[PDB]
């Protein structure tokens, strides 16, 4: 154990899992575009092997490159942002049925989003275009690399 | 050192770099769709840390899940395939200018492709749609997770 899972740096590789994922038609944290979410998601650091449940993380103490995460408040819900260098790659668990994000034809890099109630309940959101993997519940697995902080 | 970089298994995470990459309008190994290629690419196993220059691998000796890779011959050129669970995520090196693959609106998962001449020269190809990052030369970095063998 060298760097905590809470401490993030540019170039980190993250392996997320969203069991029993549901489909949200519009997500405010990404500017009103569809997303997949699970309330029992888990974040894996592939290189170091550390892991943590998303609902078990106090997200106001999470830092990226030495600084606190970028957070946005939408209709009384707090959303924390974990930017990535590139797009978030996700697929249905156990199958080769892959998904795609809202900016499938765009240079913009994707970013993980977390809702947290201040206690022990938290969601994890990933950008999607439609129900390409179904309406839910469905197990999905995501892979991405952590990128620099938003400007 | 437990498993060689030549040995691959489902769930492995690969960090590829395609320095001074060029743009190919049509790639046969992917059914005549554009690709990016570099002749000095490097394959990095993120979890185990092992790395190898793509030109330094005898690709006929590479195995995935205990079996040899799927290879195709197009106009006398041999292409080796490394399937991935999901799409290949790549971006320009040092920037947030991300790219997208040819099947951006498709469930189909992506797969890395390598050309090898039987000696010490080899290329690495990634699926793309257009010159979203330029015509080349340009440094790009790709991230993906190794998937099951083709059926």
């Amino acid at each position: 154990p060298a760097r905590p899972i809470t401490n993030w740096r540019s170039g980190d590789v993250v392996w997320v899992t969203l069991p029993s994922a549901e489909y949200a038609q519009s997500q405010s944290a990404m500017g009103s575009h569809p997303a997949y979410w699970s309330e029992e998601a888990t974040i894996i650091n592939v290189a170091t092997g550390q892991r943590a449940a998303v609902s078990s993380i106090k997200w106001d103490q999470v830092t990226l490159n030495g600084k606190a995460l970028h957070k946005e408040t939408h209709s009384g819900l707090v959303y924390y942002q974990l930017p990535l260098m590139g797009k978030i790659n996700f697929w249905q668990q156990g199958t080769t049925k892959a998904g795609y994000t809202y900016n499938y034809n765009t240079t913009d890099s994707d970013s993980l989003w977390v809702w947290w109630d201040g206690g022990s309940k938290a969601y994890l959101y990933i950008s999607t275009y439609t129900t390409m993997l179904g309406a839910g519940p469905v197990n999905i697995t995501g892979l991405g690399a952590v990128g620099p902080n938003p400007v | 050192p437990a498993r060689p970089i030549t040995n691959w298994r489902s769930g492995d995470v690969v960090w590829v770099t395609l320095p001074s990459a060029e743009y190919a309008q049509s790639q046969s190994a992917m059914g005549s769709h554009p690709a990016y290629w570099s002749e000095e690419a490097t394959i990095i196993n993120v979890a185990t840390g092992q790395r190898a220059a793509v030109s330094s691998i005898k690709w006929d000796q590479v195995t995935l899940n205990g079996k040899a890779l799927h290879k195709e011959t197009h106009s006398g050129l041999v292409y080796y395939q490394l399937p991935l669970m999901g799409k290949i995520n790549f971006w320009q090196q040092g920037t947030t200018k991300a790219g997208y693959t040819y099947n951006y609106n498709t469930t189909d998962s992506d797969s890395l492709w390598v050309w090898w001449d039987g000696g010490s020269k080899a290329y690495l190809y990634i699926s793309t749609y257009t010159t979203m990052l330029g015509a080349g030369p340009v440094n790009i970095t790709g991230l993906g997770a190794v998937g099951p063998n083709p059926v």
Partner: antibody
Amino acid sequence: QVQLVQSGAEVKKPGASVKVACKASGYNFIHYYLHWVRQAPGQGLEWMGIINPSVGRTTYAQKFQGRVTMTRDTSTSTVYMELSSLRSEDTAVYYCARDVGGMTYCGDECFPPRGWFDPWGQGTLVTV
Amino acid sequence: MPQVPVSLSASVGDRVTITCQASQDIGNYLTWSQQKPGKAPKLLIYDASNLQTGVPSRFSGSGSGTYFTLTISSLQPEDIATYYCQQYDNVPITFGGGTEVEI
């Protein structure tokens, strides 16, 4: 358990090569960068250079430009330091410290390598 | 990275503030370490303010960008040492200069 152990203290004459090793155990040797820091008995800490234990790249200091070479051994998880001219002012405790944050697989995308010094070595004293 | 206080002596139980100044913007890529006469320097906080696990809660960091500071709420006798601020922003790692604290 993460720990770095260094070789024993040495005494050298003016003009000689001193090779100091720093064994690594408890983690992935090739994943983390390593540094070398000198400590004169009265003065403060002087950073000397950095090493990539996966490819062997080095980045030395201007003062220690023509006199310092750093090497690694993946098989035994050890990093080496050598000082060549070795004048009397090179009497210091030499430290190996594991660097964190950027972990040698990003490459140049995270090589302003940012991370505090996870375990320092025990130290090795060299007297000229 | 000059350390403005070079040597400060304060009564047991007082508050100690030690400041570091950088030549350029660093962000939170600075750490505070404590060194006893014969030992390797021990790590107090990861970044500008991030306490190491196992270090008493007396030690607390602050500052960002260029001006950094180290605070100690109580001055128990175990505090007789030297403290250093070192940046890990740019390729040449540099250290502070040290403060000798007495009781």
